[PDB]
Design an enzyme around this catalytic site. Structure first.
Site, mmCIF file in Angstrom:
data_model
loop_
_atom_site.group_PDB
_atom_site.id
_atom_site.type_symbol
_atom_site.label_atom_id
_atom_site.label_comp_id
_atom_site.label_asym_id
_atom_site.label_seq_id
_atom_site.Cartn_x
_atom_site.Cartn_y
_atom_site.Cartn_z
ATOM 1 N N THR D 1 0.974 -1.272 -0.003
ATOM 2 C CA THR D 1 0.176 -0.081 0.115
ATOM 3 C C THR D 1 1.040 1.447 0.298
ATOM 4 O O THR D 1 2.064 1.080 0.638
ATOM 5 C CB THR D 1 -0.736 -0.429 0.866
ATOM 6 O OG1 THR D 1 -1.827 -0.867 1.355
ATOM 7 C CG2 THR D 1 -1.508 0.929 1.608
HETATM 8 C C1 LIG Z 1 -2.108 -1.457 2.537
HETATM 9 O O1 LIG Z 1 -1.146 -1.252 3.351
HETATM 10 C C2 LIG Z 1 -1.985 -3.129 2.554
HETATM 11 C C3 LIG Z 1 -3.846 -3.123 1.196
HETATM 12 O O2 LIG Z 1 -4.226 -3.715 1.315
HETATM 13 C C4 LIG Z 1 -5.082 -2.656 2.526
HETATM 14 C C5 LIG Z 1 -5.757 -2.526 1.960
HETATM 15 C C6 LIG Z 1 -7.179 -1.866 2.082
HETATM 16 C C7 LIG Z 1 -7.209 -0.591 2.513
HETATM 17 C C8 LIG Z 1 -6.157 -0.910 3.566
HETATM 18 C C9 LIG Z 1 -4.887 -1.327 2.916
HETATM 19 N N1 LIG Z 1 -2.238 -4.049 3.672
HETATM 20 C C10 LIG Z 1 -1.996 -4.831 3.724
HETATM 21 O O3 LIG Z 1 -1.362 -6.083 4.141
HETATM 22 C C11 LIG Z 1 -1.373 -5.387 2.382
HETATM 23 C C12 LIG Z 1 0.405 -6.147 2.251
HETATM 24 C C13 LIG Z 1 1.542 -5.500 3.489
HETATM 25 C C14 LIG Z 1 -1.376 -3.643 1.032
HETATM 26 C C15 LIG Z 1 -1.238 -4.328 -0.217
HETATM 27 O O4 LIG Z 1 0.501 -3.175 1.505
#
Ligand SMILES: *C(=O)[C@]1([C@@H](O)[C@@H]2C=CCCC2)NC(=O)[C@H](CC)[C@]1(C)O
Ligand SMILES: *C(=O)[C@]1([C@@H](O)[C@@H]2C=CCCC2)NC(=O)[C@H](CC)[C@]1(C)O
Ligand SMILES: *C(=O)[C@]1([C@@H](O)[C@@H]2C=CCCC2)NC(=O)[C@H](CC)[C@]1(C)O
Ligand SMILES: *C(=O)[C@]1([C@@H](O)[C@@H]2C=CCCC2)NC(=O)[C@H](CC)[C@]1(C)O
Ligand SMILES: *C(=O)[C@]1([C@@H](O)[C@@H]2C=CCCC2)NC(=O)[C@H](CC)[C@]1(C)O
Ligand SMILES: *C(=O)[C@]1([C@@H](O)[C@@H]2C=CCCC2)NC(=O)[C@H](CC)[C@]1(C)O
Ligand SMILES: *C(=O)[C@]1([C@@H](O)[C@@H]2C=CCCC2)NC(=O)[C@H](CC)[C@]1(C)O
Ligand SMILES: *C(=O)[C@]1([C@@H](O)[C@@H]2C=CCCC2)NC(=O)[C@H](CC)[C@]1(C)O
EC number: 3.4.25.1
Lengths: 223, 222, 239, 222, 223, 222, 222, 222
Positions: D1
């Site tokens: 993210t």
């Molecule tokens: C990002 O922080 C991420 C997202 O999947 C998540 C989904 C929707 C809104 C809040 C953020 N969180 C995770 O655990 C993933 C893996 C590290 C991510 C893609 O980074």
């Protein structure tokens, strides 16, 4: 996995399923688990595939090696002992998860009575062995289902063909209750493999005979 | 287990397999995993059998409870939120092995455009939800196989019947690769169950239609 | 990582993605994961980078070593056994996080029927091997996506070029669903690498045909995406 | 993210990627991570999705709740404090793996100087907050890449549009180096979302505008 | 498992049950646990099957090996020491769950008084041995029930035949209270095995003799 | 322990062995494990004896309690739910080694078709239940042997007497392969107990009938 | 287990009980724990039976081995050192639960004064030894009871026979308070064994003499 | 410890040994383990002394408490249930090591047939109970020896005196093989205690009768 073996008047039959898995995933559909190890013996192996396969390959080499060096094959008791020693040698690895357990079927050319010269021998992880006296045996995650099925069907065994049918039906019952054992696959045309051994030696049963038995079992239960 | 849901012009379909297991052992062959939870929604659940059954049952009660008390059903967003809260409440138990994950499919009577009023919503163990926009979703140990199959078949979905066919084929592909998902059982005559939802409401798909589709898939692959 | 291999009439093709990562970080974009190991075989490796490269390098040396010593190359079965033994030898290290798994593709000059002399063999961490007979195989974190994709596309493989295309499309689907597998990079001009093997031997596929196939897959999915919708609704528009 | 926020003369912009993952698998491609929480503020959240969405939803309700009860909105400092308290309240759950970190962007209507009334505030797991003074900030697994990119591009921000461009390019660099951050998806037409806030309030940036900036960055690097 | 051994005027008898289990499952019904190890000794083993069987086999070989090399058999004390050393050698393995404990019965041809030349020797996991002086001993999960039974029946042991009958009844009581010990199986016709040793040497007791004793015990308790 | 239950035309039969053990030791030879819990239902229980006995006793009280309070017995579905809730209530203790699992057999007086009004329901440790549709079920350490035996013998069940015979033989097969299940004891004259339920209610099967069946099975196999 | 040793004018006596146990169970009633190891020494051992028996056997062999090789027996100090070294060699096994502790009694033919040539030596698990000079010593689970008894009776020791009586009474007192030490068994006629050593060498005390003393102690306490 | 109980024509007898230990040490020689708990019942307890005494004391109070409150004594089944509930209540503590197990003997005044009105009930740590049907039972570390002894001697029981003799002999065999169970102490004149119960109620057996039986058993074995 499920490997079965049973004695019939004049010989022995051993059959095995074709499935390999990784956790819940079906990773193989045509694995062969029953090998002809010498003219009068077959080995079926369950557990860790890498070890299982090595066991079958090394064991066949060891049996023929003795034969070429000594001019005569090992006695059946000697064959059992060599398999047992090989399993025992894998005990440490087995404790670490590389666990493989063979099931041995053979015809003893030196036995006094030919009709009962068939032999079935099971092995535990420490190399312990037992010459089966009940007529049949099985190894693998579907073995209990297979054995309880053969317990009820064994009285129908009077020759090699009724022997083979009971073996295929036992594997069918194992697959019906154990998701780790593969049933007959009519779409792909893949069926359990089998070896029959009598006074004339060990021979692979042709796939078309097994296909016919499997289809009959399926049709029969379909109604 | 594998439960699939996909959207077709005018509605949505959800279908589930019939297998239950205990370790490697097949312990059930006719379990129903897809439930009509109210007139316009269906819930499919994967995970711990005891928890899944309880979620579906309590959830349908909760939806109707609101409707009787307030005189009107909850908005689709409200239905999503209640299911998410229910899942979140099981988080503690889930970490101890009582995990259950629902997949929600529905038809939103209040959506502006009827052809697309179909809804598919997935949930994670902490109660997070996501309204699906790609057309289909799946949950359970066979879900990745089902989704990769629907990714290739989805362009064939043009109506309720082709939708139903693609769903059944996705479950067929899941069973083909996942030993924990049950394929069509021709010997016993047991097939995946399915629910279709459109402007006229949620209705169970008759077994004979599924059997037909299943046999055609099998014939085609042989 | 994703490495795929598939048989086509008269040969076999193996292709691999170019990504290397460290946790979530993209640490490499041009890694080559598929190697020609001898005139009739290619090896693709997934897992720990250090072990993967070493397996390929040592294995090629071992095959040629036998050939120079004995005057003739190992039979295909012997080649399989040597690679299995090498993998088995790394089992302790692998249980300690140094795991690598190879996928082997070859053409057996001694096979009876030439059209099907293509060979694909997979290996597990203990050295167990399996000669594949469903036509294709894949290893790496994107392998399940690649295989489910090939399951639906395989009936289109009728020759080396259609086979190459399907392998590239399988890698594309793996990258589309697995963040650890790299898709075609149009900005940098980096694409999956591939090796094709037939009766005339193993040869690297030139980057330009793979680049063409890749853009064609992308334009094709771009078109299908616009044609499609979500049960009637279109949430995005290309511009 | 990756969520980024930066100040430009007269306002602030916040933008977020669209990816959701589960381990190495890409589980979502259209997730919206930036929300307008009240007329002058936007919240972007990284970490555990269930918790991230709850935070944004609960926080918007809390801000409007105060406004209706007291007749006036909270001061910007009060908005910060409430968000901080909400984060602090999740600390036990966070240490248990349910960790979510918000990034707050706003326009302070009560600030003396309007050109600099833009506000960017970051938060840590314990509820600690910091009003950012360097002009930009980012949270999520791609935040370091995004910040190093903005460090070099920030001198180009002279108004809302160049601010929006720099934010999209920062997200592009984050996706280029972090597999957990989604880049612009030209095949599906999915791009980062953004919110711009100035004296007239917070508004969602139309997708078409972000698509055009994204294509220009790509062409430029090609 | 239960193996019993008792002295009678002029000799000794050793008998063992036929069951093998894997957890709660009965995995074998005809295992033989008592072996004639040389002309004047028998060994019965409880515990891990693989180690049990290897003990008996190697022990028999070792005793005959000495005899062929030296021209004369080991003294009874020497036989005891060899078995003890073999058990001690398995101690590291035993601590890992591969534990096996033998019970040795023999007739000492060099003992001064022939009526009491019978010998019973028990062993612990560390190779400690003890020549039993109270007339009987037993090893295995049913050994306490067997011993408490022999304590009440031992006064009836006046010769080799009543000794054999008591041994069978002690095994019967062991099976009656220990699910891991197999009772006489009248349906399949499988009964405990036994070995009798006196001045003429060690001999296997015919199954038909044991079956008669077993049926009689059963009839009695039925009323 | 092995408890089996099977449906026959017009009713259902449930039978259980008589053994109790402590480790390898046989500690009991005449335990009764099958109880008539109300006029149309029987409960058999496997697992920890204190809990098993408690469950049967508490459950029968609960069923009659409802009947006295409401004037009518619970519907079969309600009887199932109560037993499930009771099992669920013991989950914590069961993870502590106090696990007990019931098997429920009954005749539904309100079922449309009388010949098939027989009911068999199994339960897992979390309170999950499943109405069996394959005709028979079993619980306890000998259950797999019993179920595999009934799978081959079930086609012989045409009425209550052949149903009883097949149940006794299944128990015999369970004892033949599971040292924890007790076989018929000819010396002491102790045999499995059984309950038959049909439109006239649940009645205990007299010992003499079971003894004749047992002897016939034994003669047949020798 | 209890083994005692005490000096009397002109010699030494060592006596041991006959019990062996396995947990709470009495597993033996006639074990011999005191051995004549050479013409002028006796060894009594407590702890692990397997190790104790091997210690006594190997030690006797080692003493005679030296004698045959060198033509003369080891000095008493040399005998002590050999036993200490043997105990020390068992230390690793002893830390693993294979712990055995010997008690050595002897008559030193080379001592200056014959009336006091008696020797008693105790040993610890690491091979430390101590020549006892207070007149008596004991090892085993009943040793504290035996020593406190001998502390009160020792002034009665004036020759070999009274020394023997005190030793037997100390073993009696050990068995009276320690369930792991066996008392005289009048039903089976089994009594403690003993060895007396004086200028004429070590000799086994006949059972009848011990039985006589034991009966007198019992009569006396009755 | 060993406590035995057996039925004879017209009544029941319960007898217990007198030993208490702490590890290997004999810490008591005259403990009484069998209590008359009401006019028709006796309780014998093994395990942790503190808890065992508390059980017998509290239980007698509870039985008489009911009788005074309700005007009539509890039925025998009710007495069993109350003892079971008391045991179950100690389950957490028993897991922690304060484990105590009672053995109940009684005469049921309301039984149909007086000659067999004798009752013997055993209990496990979770409160599970079992009404013995084979004639005798025992609890404690010497119980298996006592039961194997009674199995061979039970056919000699024809009345109260032969039943008392067999009970004493079973305790003697338990002491002969279990160092934790005390045998008859002829030196101190301390013997097992016993309670006989028949239609006239529960009465302590006089020490002199037991002493005579014990001496006869001892001479017999000599
Ligand atoms: C990002 O922080 C991420 C997202 O999947 C998540 C989904 C929707 C809104 C809040 C953020 N969180 C995770 O655990 C993933 C893996 C590290 C991510 C893609 O980074
Ligand atoms: C069977 O035992 C099984 C097979 O995968 C394996 C493969 C080839 C021949 C040897 C047997 N081994 C396993 O670990 C699987 C999982 C339970 C298997 C399918 O049972
Ligand atoms: C599926 O998720 C599965 C089913 O047994 C279960 C049963 C009924 C409805 C809810 C889902 N759950 C499991 O735990 C199995 C093993 C991985 C299963 C077959 O997948
Ligand atoms: C793939 O398997 C992968 C590559 O980084 C690695 C690099 C070069 C050749 C061998 C394969 N290995 C990993 O550890 C990554 C993370 C799971 C990877 C991208 O998958
Ligand atoms: C007995 O000791 C037992 C036998 O299975 C075993 C088999 C053959 C000869 C050696 C002894 N060993 C075990 O591990 C079982 C566990 C309950 C057994 C039945 O007691
Ligand atoms: C059976 O489940 C079993 C019985 O002892 C117990 C006793 C009475 C009625 C309920 C069931 N429970 C156990 O724990 C034993 C060992 C696995 C048992 C014999 O199976
Ligand atoms: C004594 O030390 C004791 C004896 O069993 C043992 C047997 C023969 C000679 C050496 C000593 N060893 C033990 O482990 C028992 C338990 C404390 C014992 C009875 O004390
Ligand atoms: C017996 O069970 C035992 C007794 O000491 C104790 C004392 C008085 C009445 C209750 C029972 N309990 C123990 O813990 C001892 C050691 C195992 C004991 C002698 O068995």
């Amino acid at each position: 996995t499920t490997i079965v073996a049973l004695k019939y008047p004049g010989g022995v039959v051993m059959a095995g399923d074709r499935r390999s898995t990784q956790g819940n995933m079906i990773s193989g559909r045509d694995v062969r688990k029953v090998y002809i190890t010498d003219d009068y013996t077959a080995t079926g192996i369950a557990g860790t595939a890498a070890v299982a396969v090595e066991f079958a390959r090394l064991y066949a080499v060891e049996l023929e090696h003795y034969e070429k060096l000594e001019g005569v094959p090992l006695t059946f008791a000697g064959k059992i002992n060599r398999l047992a020693i090989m399993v025992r040698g894998n005990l440490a690895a087995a404790m670490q998860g590389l666990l493989a357990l063979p099931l041995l079927a053979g015809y003893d050319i030196h036995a006094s009575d030919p009709q009962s010269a068939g032999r079935i021998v099971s092995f535990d992880a420490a190399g312990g062995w037992n010459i089966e006296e009940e007529g049949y045996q099985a190894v693998g995650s579907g073995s209990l289902f297979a054995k309880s099925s053969m317990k009820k069907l064994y009285s129908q065994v009077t020759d090699g063909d009724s022997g083979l049918r009971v073996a295929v039906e036992a594997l069918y019952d194992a697959a019906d209750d154990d998701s780790a054992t593969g049933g007959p696959d009519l779409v792909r045309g893949i069926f359990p493999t089998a070896v029959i051994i009598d006074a004339d030696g060990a021979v692979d049963v042709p796939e078309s005979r097994i296909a016919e038995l499997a289809r009959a079992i399926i049709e029969s239960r379909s109604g």
